[PDB]
């Protein structure tokens with residue numbers, strides 16, 4: 283079997299037939315894929331709808347004893363059951379192009395990808411990263427492409443890549459768990475490919491867990507079997523994206539003041555796993571934020587964010603278009619900030 287399509291469900295009764303129909307409609311031999319549904323203890327008739335398809339599909343159907351609260355444990359249970367040469371995770375409210383498995387199979391037989399990104403399309407207003415799907419590419423890296431900007435598991439992974447390297451979703455960390463999963467796949471993959479010929483994938487609490495995942499990602503990058511300068515650059519790119527687009531961006535302007543110490547402490551533990559030499563590699567505006575996160579100093583961290591957002595700085599000059607900023611009295615100057 284080429285493929286195991288892995289589907290975590292939870293009270294998906296109103297929309298699961300869209301996914302199930304798109305899998306039944308695959309222009310691909312039924313003998314060469316299975317559909318692995320693990321249900322997160324739904325209280326509706328999800329399982330009964332799923333059963334209607336057991337003749338159109340090779341279907342494995344499981345259900346957890348109690349709701350795990352997220353797709354991590356369901357997907358892990360399915361991954362242990364998968365016998366496909368490759369796995370594809372599709373969420374219960376999404377669906378795929380009828381030629382997805384056929385095209386992916388042909389691309390894999392031509393290029394032997396270990397991780398294969400497949401172009402996504404947002405429906406009903408949803409987006410959907412795009413900057414890495416402008417072209418089809420048989421081989422990309424973390425440094426010459428934009429793959430680090432999509433870490434959802436809505437991708438194709440060589441089953442043996444995951445299992446031989448013990449790559450599973452963290453079950454006890456309910457936030458951003460797929461970022462660690464896909465980062466680990468990327469870092470262990472001998473070949474990462476991007477297939478963009480058509481739209482294939484149609485897409486529809488405290489921060490302790492969140493920043494533990496981020497810290498595990500930092501440790502994972504730094505420990506990979508890659509050149510040292512390349513690890514540092516990869517970590518810098520991950521930090522660029524994380525501070526620009528994650529919940530970290532602007533948290534000191536949005537989070538209740540009483541809760542920001544808890545944020546800065548958990549963020550600080552993440553950034554403290556980033557060696558300081560890496561700060562020189564990150565976008566300059568983020569350097570004061572890395573500095574005050576490591577020191578776990580929320581007052582100065584918040585002044586930086588507030589200064590950026592209102593254009594006021596305690597002391598600054600401009601040298602060839604870039605600012606040298608002292609954000610508060612007695613604090614270090616940060617130089618060359620765009």
Ligand SMILES: O=c1ccn([C@@H]2O[C@H](COP(=O)(O)OP(=O)(O)O)[C@@H](O)[C@H]2O)c(=O)[nH]1
Nearest residue numbers: 290291292322350351352353356373374375
């Ligand atoms: O307790 C839960 C809740 C969600 N899900 C599944 O995990 C995936 C999370 O997807 P969802 O579409 O709800 O997230 P979103 O679209 O908001 O990103 C879906 O396949 C759900 O069926 C789950 O397995 N357990």
Ligand SMILES: [Mn+2]
Nearest residue numbers: 373375376486
């Ligand atoms: Mn969804």
